[PDB]
Amino acid sequence: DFSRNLYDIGEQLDSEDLASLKFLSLDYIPQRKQEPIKDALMLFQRLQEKRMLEESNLSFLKELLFRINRLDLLITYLNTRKEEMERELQTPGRAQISAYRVMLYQISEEVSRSELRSFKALLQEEISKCKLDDDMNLLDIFIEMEKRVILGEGKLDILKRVCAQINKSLLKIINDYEEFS
Amino acid sequence: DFSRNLYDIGEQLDSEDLASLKFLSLDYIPQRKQEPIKDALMLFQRLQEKRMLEESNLSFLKELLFRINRLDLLITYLNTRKEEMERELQTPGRAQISAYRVMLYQISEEVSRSELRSFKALLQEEISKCKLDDDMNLLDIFIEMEKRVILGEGKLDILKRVCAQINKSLLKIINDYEEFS
Fold it and tell me: Are A120 and B165 in contact (CB under 8 A)?
């Protein structure tokens, strides 16, 4: 009963819904493991894979659907109302999605298209002014590059991009590394 | 005697050496547990803590000293020559530092101060590459903000800074989040 019903819920969702649900699951499935999920059913399988979703274990499904405001699916397939879910989530700790993620999603729902363009513009303003100070030595800079994830054992792209403009011999070293690995 | 000698070697090293050796130890001691390590002798203690450095087990100590080209300490206190260590590390696998880390360190050794200026400039160029195409919705933008590590569970500065220029209600959301933590 549960499995077929989860299939029906799987089909009733559109793209925007899947994006939202992919976001609201980031507490359990890292960013790194979200490219594999292309449709809602694969997300269901990956959620049950961590035993966060089972028959008689629908807390997280109910919460997810309420947050993305698909109350029609809650009623049609889960027999759950809005006020019931509000009562459930307003009792401390019963909410399973972090306040961080819910905050971000609600910021997203409040924003229009024009306001989104404003956000892109302002974010490109604040990014086009990153300031690493003058007291960081090179090794620290490599550590920051690994931190901001632009350099790694298998991401020599940017490192080669800068070294190629500094001096070739460095690029020679890098090529020796990646060609002997 | 072993402890006394390791103390003497511990004090003979300067700051640049400690930075280098701290880097070349990143295969075993994560970034996070290196702020506690403030001096070279403490680094020795943290190396013995993981039993990669023992009495009669100096492979990694010798390797460390050779890499940072402190051959004077190798000879003075360890009675070990340059060419012997070269033979040691050129025998496969006996070098204990990964080719990645050693590659980064030699890139560091080759670079002058001016060339480092060029590296800072070019890297600030590549970070100020915005991407942010017209098909990314807000949530994706949040995910890249977390990537470039300018947004996080406890780093709401930039997010509030942009929302304050878009519309206050967003700022109200963020403040409600962080004052509820």
Answer: no
Between CA B159 and CA A123 the distance in angstroms is 9
Interface of A with B in 22-41 (CB under 8 A): 23, 31
Contact B139 A165 (CB under 8 A): no
CB within 8 Å: B162 and A119? yes
Domain at B34, CATH number: 1.10.533.10
Cβ of residue A111 closer than 8 Å to a chain B Cβ: yes
State whether B122 and A147 contact (CB < 8 Å).
no
DSSP notation for A70-111: -HHHHHHHH---HHHHHHHHHSTT---S-HHHHHHHHHHHH-
Contact B99 A181 (CB under 8 A): yes
| Residue B99 vs residues A113, A179, B89: alpha-carbon distances, Å | 48, 11, 12
Per the entry, the structure determination technique was: X-ray
Structural tokens at position A19? 């994006």
Neighbour tally for A107: CB within 10 Å: 22
Instruction: Round to whole Å and give the CA distance between B154 and A98.
Output: 13
Provide the domain limits for residue A66. Answer: 1-110
B contacts of A154 (beta carbons < 8 Å): none
